[PDB]
Design a protein around this ligand. Structure first.
Ligand SMILES: NC(=O)c1ccc[n+]([C@@H]2O[C@H](COP(=O)([O-])OP(=O)(O)OC[C@H]3O[C@@H](n4cnc5c(N)ncnc54)[C@H](O)[C@@H]3O)[C@@H](O)[C@H]2O)c1
Ligand SMILES: NC(=O)c1ccc[n+]([C@@H]2O[C@H](COP(=O)([O-])OP(=O)(O)OC[C@H]3O[C@@H](n4cnc5c(N)ncnc54)[C@H](O)[C@@H]3O)[C@@H](O)[C@H]2O)c1
Ligand SMILES: NC(=O)c1ccc[n+]([C@@H]2O[C@H](COP(=O)([O-])OP(=O)(O)OC[C@H]3O[C@@H](n4cnc5c(N)ncnc54)[C@H](O)[C@@H]3O)[C@@H](O)[C@H]2O)c1
Lengths: 333, 333, 333, 333
């Protein structure tokens, strides 16, 4: 029902658009990207190495990007404050360029007529939300919000179930993550982050990530009780969270499995999945869950110290959550 | 000094051979592999996708494999008990086929004339040793021993320094490991381990490993205090250990760095390395250390709960340790 | 309509099965494979790293593999002559193990009750067929036939159109091919073909192939006028043919494009595809065509000397052709 | 003996520097690059995912980059005309940024005191040279020249031998090429060349290249007789040329092997290599040849139509040729 504008037609921008058209929860009416012109957008949206060809029609007609017969107004503005979102009917704007993540920068979309902005990435100051964890805390006074990161969306739902049932005293996370657009094909310049400049296809690359610490923001009781790091590995998509945590209350591995499965079939259905199958990363290709607990992969040392594994299609799950968040925001109008 | 025979001229078999001829600490005099004839061995030893062309000379001459002018007797037996090690003068036999890891199966080499057998992998019952951690425990009454696994050789040295200084109350390990010969190029049969049959190039594959629990064998005080699992990723070589542990005594990260660096420059020099550089996996290709602590990659939640990272060339480091172990055994004869 | 048995539940065996159910052209009633028991077959068929999770249902029940509610009888015989195909009612058998490609070896299935056998690979003596090129040459006297190779199925349709219209004087083909089950994850034993044993993830590997010369089997006028070779590269699926040929009747590139496009919309529809889009290999993942002409990738030096490019999903296209061939055979009974 | 400056410390810039320091042919005295500060240069030079760690010494000292005890002046100018090469003592300047390939743009280095400029890439108007093919045509009146491309440096030597001996009527080339810095890790923007923006790890990507046509420049008699294209594949380094050509005079494949072997042992030694071994791409990692003929990989259809295969480390071979060219230029001062 709510009309949406998308700033940045990258992996997230394009997949959020796909999710929107596939679920029908929101209607994309405008897209802005100064580097990708209309004809090129058709091509980028139609063919996707990771998620396959688009199911439907996508064409350029009279200057509009038409997807399944729905005309989308296209903008090519480098400065957010200059995008005429209002004229195009875009009430909500998905900020997915990665360069306007602060309240001040993301707020520029409001100058163009947009009513609310959803940053598809962590924000230093904008309120962060995670579907299934604290999205109910959202309220109409918030005009600029964040949907956190893919990794936080994977860890948070799992951590909530674990903390709620056994209490997390402290935890350390490692995410074995697929390569992303910020990486390089061969050893190249990355002045601010040297390891990230090394060839992505040749290396296992350690990288910092505030995704675990961020959980404390969506689950206040866990603030200061979690942190971790990441390892970028040579796969194009799908990542996995490895959470090592200490529990305050005794928890046999089978008890953990029971509560997680119960959560996946109830309140967290569609967000937190559960499996006992002998899965591998590709099995989650295009899987829309934010997190899928892998029962057989985890291992416990004792009743108070365990390692829990959860899979996440870092592109598809997150993109669907952005749409879900906007759908929820719309119901609160 | 001690004359050695190699059973299974594979990644470890060939690299152990390369390591032996480089240091000259032991003399390879015989090799057995029914799946690689003499002329084929020349080619397999001469060219290596991972470690480059052999630096010396290798040729087939008078029915022997000649490396740097040293003739090696070649056997082609599937049955270990049928190998005439004695006639070839092989005193120690490196059992690197991966299919004769028990005392009973590995002991077959003794029937052929060998005096001792070193299993290049963990064993269900053969005494396990890790250079720099418990190799001094070895004695002449042991005719069949194990050099553990690559992963245990990476974790044990680090765990030793951490435990000796701060005391490890409990720890959970994850190793992001390069693919190996047991994996498949595309989804194929692996009846005993379903996940391992899935395409190695396309997937992050969780796998069980007793490497962490095994540390309890080489470091008795840590028995039952460590365990973990592995993730196989799409890289041809070099792996990394991710140890999440709770310490008894307060250990600020800088103090952890200090003690590990001190150990690397002293009693564990050559076994445990230390670096503060912004390294990635490829920086350790052909690195002979058993474990190299990555100061910048690790992260601490507090003074008693930290995640430690250590790199290891799973093929090269381990192969050099097999040679070091035999050299130590020889010194006690 | 015709009831089919599948010997060898591998990439081709499983995808032929998937194709049979998805297309519904033939009915799979039996499967034989000594290295994959019933429960494992459910897993291998349900999850696929390359083509995604099966969209229907698959379960084990009372010793049967039930796909979309259809019970499949399961055999576990290593000896083809011992498989009781008749017990299951299987009339045609798809021989896809890769080890019974001769008439004598493939014919073993007739002893168990099967009526005809289709070898999913080239055969030294079994008549070979390529859908769209010479499948009409099949007749009821042939009880054992071959569906050629994936590469021949890609080149033959294209060669047919080019020869029919311009006449091929001579041609040399190179196929840049995805890795297959015959390759190794790391440098390993491959006594008959040394290059094939080298690490598949690390290398571009030259390989011989009789696929181009084999076009003559199905297009006799091209006997002695074609041959080529292959390069195996680090991709899990989808390959490409690169045909460099000299024409008898000079033709502008646009005219070549015209006749190929015409063919793709006519008699060769579904077999020979045509595209002018800026495609890459992934765009053909799960594409059922035997060959798809890439108009923009090819290049002509002049009107009589050109390089033509055609894509093929080596797993999916071929598997669908096997089903198409059996449907055609059934119509001739 | 000649003092050299390097503009652009990328793959080629850094590798040309490595080659310069291990031949004494030339001495690097200055380097310019605005996107890589001094401390970062130390890191990028000392570690290399493809060619391993630098085995000599490298450190930042007193504002200069010191390699093997030799101080190098470091500049950070974005405008070539502003670099003070003259005062730094740089007589020749290697232009390896890839953005100043024309006579006009490359000449900017002359304004700063440089005497001659060697463009490490094809130039639209600067005279191009290929060592072993037409470098004897260079003379000291030329202040700005081009060393062509890696691909042209691979094809030219081979084409010369084939043409000189049998005469090339016409030919079409395909190069299966490793990924480069211009590619993307995941589907991203490449507005000018859409296929090049597609994920480099996931795809075989067809791409245009004028390397074959350029051979007609270094070998005038082949002007307009050669052209071709490329396929980018998921490997980090080492590429291969696939030349399909028509010969004027008859030539059995063994005759071709004979003349290529002869050329490699004489006039083209070190430039054109020859092998009959069962090699794969990795065997050419860090190989300094411009082209290595693979006897066993090629195939002939008849005495006048053949497919010839030649390997080339696109980074290492070329970088060494740049140094060899400057050494030649110096001998002609
Ligand atoms: N590769 C690593 O990173 C690594 C590290 C530490 C330990 N290991 C262990 O070392 C052992 C070998 O590993 P690898 O990676 O070298 O494997 P590999 O497959 O490369 O080598 C095995 C070799 O054994 C030969 N072989 C098989 N059966 C034989 C028989 N009956 N008699 C004689 N030879 C036979 C094979 O032809 C092959 O060359 C395994 O137990 C493995 O778990 C591997
Ligand atoms: N994969 C491709 O791209 C492709 C394309 C065209 C043709 N082919 C051809 O198809 C055949 C199979 O190839 P694949 O890629 O599916 O191989 P694969 O290894 O994936 O499958 C082979 C299957 O045969 C089974 N098997 C082995 N021995 C058996 C026996 N004695 N009885 C019954 N089953 C047995 C194995 O367990 C395995 O599941 C080969 O001849 C191959 O050349 C492959
Ligand atoms: N890599 C190969 O395989 C290969 C082989 C032969 C030729 N080439 C050619 O060599 C050139 C460089 O290629 P590469 O692969 O080394 O690329 P690269 O991206 O690795 O290196 C380019 C370098 O130029 C620097 N740079 C950019 N603008 C600059 C400026 N204005 N002044 C100074 N430095 C600047 C960058 O920071 C970077 O470090 C290209 O023209 C390319 O076509 C590449």
């Amino acid at each position: 029902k709510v009309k949406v504008g998308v700033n940045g037609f990258g992996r997230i921008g394009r997949l959020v658009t796909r999710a929107a058209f596939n679920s029908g929860k929101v209607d994309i009416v405008a897209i802005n990207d100064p580097f990708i012109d209309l004809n090129y957008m058709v091509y980028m949206f139609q063919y996707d190495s990771t998620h396959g060809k688009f199911h439907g029609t996508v064409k350029a007609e009279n200057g509009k990007l038409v997807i399944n017969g729905n005309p989308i107004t296209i903008f090519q503005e480098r400065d957010p404050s200059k995008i005429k979102w209002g004229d195009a009917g875009a009430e909500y704007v998905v900020e997915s360029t990665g360069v306007f993540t602060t309240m001040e920068k993301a707020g520029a979309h409001l100058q163009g007529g947009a009513k609310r902005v959803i940053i598809s990435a962590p924000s230093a100051d904008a309120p962060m939300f995670v579907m299934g964890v604290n999205h109910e805390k959202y309220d109409n006074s918030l005009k600029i919000i964040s949907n956190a990161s893919c990794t936080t969306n994977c860890l948070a739902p799992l951590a909530k179930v674990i903390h709620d049932n056994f209490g997390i005293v402290e935890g350390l996370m490692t995410t074995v993550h697929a390569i992303t657009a910020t990486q390089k094909t061969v050893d190249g310049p990355s002045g601010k982050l040297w390891r990230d400049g090394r060839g992505a296809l040749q290396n296992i690359i350690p990288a910092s990530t505030g995704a675990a610490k961020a959980v404390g923001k969506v689950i206040p009781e866990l603030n200061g009780k979690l942190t971790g790091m990441a390892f970028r590995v040579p796969t194009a998509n799908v990542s996995v969270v490895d959470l090592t945590c200490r529990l305050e209350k005794p928890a046999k591995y089978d008890d953990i499995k029971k509560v997680v499965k119960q959560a996946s079939e109830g309140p967290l259905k569609g967000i937190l999945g559960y499996t006992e199958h002998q899965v591998v990363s590709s099995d989650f290709n295009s899987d829309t869950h934010s997190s899928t607990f892998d029962a057989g992969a985890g291992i416990a040392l004792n009743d108070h110290f365990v390692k829990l594994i959860s899979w996440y299609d870092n592109e598809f799950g997150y993109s669907n959550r952005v749409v879900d968040l906007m759908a929820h925001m719309a119901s609160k109008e």
